[PDB]
Amino acid sequence: ESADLRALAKHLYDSYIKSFPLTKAKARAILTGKTTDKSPFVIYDMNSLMMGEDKIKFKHITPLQEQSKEVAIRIFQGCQFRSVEAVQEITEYAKSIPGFVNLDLNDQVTLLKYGVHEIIYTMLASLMNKDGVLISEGQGFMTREFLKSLRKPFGDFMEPKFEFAVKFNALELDDSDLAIFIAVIILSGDRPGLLNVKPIEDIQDNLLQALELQLKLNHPESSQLFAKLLQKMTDLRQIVTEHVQLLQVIKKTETDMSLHPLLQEIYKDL
Amino acid sequence: ESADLRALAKHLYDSYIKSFPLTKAKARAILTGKTTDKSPFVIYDMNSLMMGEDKIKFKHITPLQEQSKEVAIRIFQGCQFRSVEAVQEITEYAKSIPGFVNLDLNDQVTLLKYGVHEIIYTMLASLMNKDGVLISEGQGFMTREFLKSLRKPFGDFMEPKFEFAVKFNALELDDSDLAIFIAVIILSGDRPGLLNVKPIEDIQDNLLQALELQLKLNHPESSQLFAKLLQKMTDLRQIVTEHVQLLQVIKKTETDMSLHPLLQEIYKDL
Ligand SMILES: O=C(O)[C@H](Cc1ccccc1)Oc1ccc(-c2ccccc2)cc1
């Protein structure tokens, strides 16, 4: 019954909004979109970063570039802190999806563990455009040009995403679309370790139906959109694979240090 | 109109039969040991592989292996024969896809370059069951167990495809289904290098409509099969990749060998 799907879509959309601070609507208005009433603090150079990290609401480190920690490492470490926040926001949204909390606790952990990266890159695209990504609750903007002028290892760290984001955003999806999509991702069924796949695919199936209806009604002239969105899941997978790679590579730069114990402890890998 | 779509499905199914000698239909008939009009010779060890050259058209070596192109090599030399055989075939099927031959000559080469291996592992699935795969046009059956006990590297060339096959075959798709799915794979548009994307996406958007109707009609009691099928394309991409990196391994540990030109031309790391 379409009566239930429309209902399921509104529920999830509602949770998505109350779960994620920066929405794509809120992000798009700030971005390319005009809507100028509080412009962001651009970061196009080493000086932009420095001459700004001391005036931007950031809770980790301040501008100190001169034989005192490097810029390429400070930015990466910075994205890990934030991704720990996102993981928490995603976990909360996961518990709003009908059926998720009723699943075996182990599988819930497995679904989150293996779906968090795909969700993050999907939402990252809401903050990015061909020229950069919004930063800090949408208070800054780190240009795409800067990010590529980063150290030898971090130079390819964000370029692939930018390429994915541009294609993904061409779909012109809104938060009500992304909400259902993000749920489909969480409720996969192919994640390794699942103890009871039936309920998971049962829910994904119901989420997939909602998503389909949501796209037909919300984008009536955008043919086969549903199909395009699902085939984007192939792109995210590579994005996640390719990500664990550069990670292992980075895991061969900074390592043995006695001050990282309880700090590294908080930032395992995901 | 859903009538042109049905006509497209029929058209495609028709060219599919005309380009592929061993359909899933014939393959399943041979695999269901019940149908004994012509059963296969089961390869599951050296003696079997050895005797396999008597009841099959195995032009390879029957006697000693190691000091004369070991068993492993022999098996993959043939494998290589099949891919090129499949490429030429898939290449023939592609020309039947409406509009494909009208695309930019270069894009045609790109659609095939990235499409053909995803298609080969899709169709290869029709020849597998949890236990093994039919070889030499169904005349033979090589055990999954035997294939996995080969030399350190060659040993794990097929396992990831058997795992794909087991879950992909659970979808119970038939030749008329795969025909349209196989066409959706080629007419991607997200393939690297494509000079002209719009025209390509107009064809695929057409192929996806067809496939959607085909699945609803041919598998009415199968919810979200369409979606399930499209997500399977993510598995395909991954399989292609692990494969190439394996090929790169042999390329270094076997300098006396050779990866066929056509396959070499198609393959590019990264
Ligand atoms: O990569 C390819 O194009 C094919 C794809 C394929 C794999 C399994 C069944 C049918 C096709 O798989 C090959 C794997 C190994 C080899 C090979 C050839 C000579 C020596 C060592 C490996 C050739 C093809």
Distance CA B194, CA B204 (A): 14
Q: How was this structure determined?
A: X-ray
Q: How far apart are CA B25 and CA A136, in angstroms?
A: 57
Cβ contacts of B241 on chain A, cutoff 8 Å: 241
User: Which residues of B carry a binding-site annotation for rosiglitazone?
Assistant: 80-83, 117, 243, 267
- Beta-carbon contacts of A8 under 8 Å, excluding residues fewer than 6 positions away, are A98, A180, A206, A207, A210
Instruction: For residues B23 and B134, give the distance between their C-alpha atoms in angstroms, rounded to a whole number.
Output: 12
For the CA of B87, the closest atom of ligand 1 is 3
Contacts A–B by Cβ distance under 8 A: 41
Q: Which residues of B touch A212 (CB under 8 A)?
A: 227
The residue whose CA is least distant from atom 8 of ligand 1 is B79
Q: How far apart are CA A221 and CA A215, in angstroms?
A: 10
Q: Which amino acid is at B128?
A: M
CA of residue B96 relative to chain centroid, distance: 18
Best probe of the B interface among A209, A224, A238, by most B CBs < 10 A, is A224
Partners of B134 in the beta sheet?
B141
Q: What is the DSSP secondary structure assignment for residue B57, as one 8-state letter?
A: -
Asked if A223 lies within 8 A of B238 by C-beta distance, the reply is no
The answer to whether B113 and B266 have CB atoms below 8 angstroms apart is yes
Bridge partner residues of A140 (DSSP): A41, A135
Dihedral in degrees, nearest 10, Cα atoms B16, B17, B21, B25: 100
Pocket of ligand 1 (CB under 6 A): B 76-77, 79-80, 82-83, 120, 124, 157, 243, 247, 250, 257, 259, 263
Instruction: Please tell me the total number of residues recorded for chain B in this structure.
Output: 270
Q: Chain A closest CA to B55's CA: distance in Å?
A: 40
Q: Helices (DSSP H) in chain B: which residue ranges?
A: 2-19, 24-31, 46-51, 71-96, 105-124, 144-147, 159-169, 175-186, 197-218, 225-253, 261-266
User: Is residue A43 within a helix (H) or strand (E), and if so which, with residue range?
Assistant: strand A41-43
Minimal-distance CA residue to ligand 1 atom 23: B80
- Going from the C-alpha of B29 to that of each of A88, A167, B89, B219, the distances in angstroms are 52, 43, 22, 20
CA dihedral angle for residue A258, residue A262, residue A264, residue A268, rounded to 10 degrees: 140
Query: Which residues are within 8 A (CB) of A61 and not within 5 positions of it... i.e. 6 or more apart?
Result: A53, A69, A74, A77, A78
How far apart (Å, rounded) are the C-alpha atoms in residues A131 and A145?
A: 7
Q: Flag if A209 and B230 touch (Cβ within 8 Å).
A: no
Q: How far apart are CA A178 and CA A171, in angstroms?
A: 11
- Tokens 């079997």 belong to B48
> B115 Cβ partners below 8 Å, 6+ apart?
B90, B94, B185, B186, B188, B191
Resolution in A: 2.6
Q: Which residue of A has its CA nearest to B197?
A: A167
Position of tokens 């890990």?
A80
CB contact under 8 A, A212 and B230: no
| Partner-chain contact A227 B212, CB within 8 Å | yes
Tell me the residue range of the domain where B184 lies: 1-270
Chain A residues touching chain B at CB-CB below 8 Å: 167, 190, 205, 208-209, 212, 223-224, 226-227, 230-231, 233-235, 237-238, 241
Shortest Cα distance from A232 to chain B (angstroms)?
A: 9
Contact B237 A234 (CB under 8 A): yes
* A237 closest CB neighbour out of B212, B226, B237: B237
| Rounded CA separation B52/B62 (Å) | 8
The conformation of residue B40, written as its DSSP 8-state character, comes to P
Which CATH number covers residue A176?
1.10.565.10
Q: Which residues of B touch A224 (CB under 8 A)?
A: 205, 208-209, 212
Does residue B150 come out as left (phi exceeding 0), alpha (psi in the -120 to 50 range) or beta? beta
Q: Tell me if B22 sits within 8 A of B138, measured CB to CB.
A: yes
- Token digits of residue A199: 């309920």
Helical segments of chain A, H only: 2-19, 24-30, 46-53, 71-94, 105-127, 144-148, 159-169, 175-186, 197-218, 225-231, 233-250, 261-264
Residue B237: its chain A contacts at CB < 8 A? 234, 237-238
What single string gives the DSSP state of each residue in A118-153? Answer: HHHHHHHHHHEETTEEEETTTTEEEEHHHHHTS-TT
Q: Which atom, in ligand 1's list, is nearest to the CA of B83?
A: 11
Report the residue among B83, B112, B156, B245 best suited for mutation to probe ligand 1: largest number of ligand atoms under 8 A from its CB.
Answer: B83
Minimal C-alpha gap between A161 and chain B (Å): 14
Domain count, chain A: 1
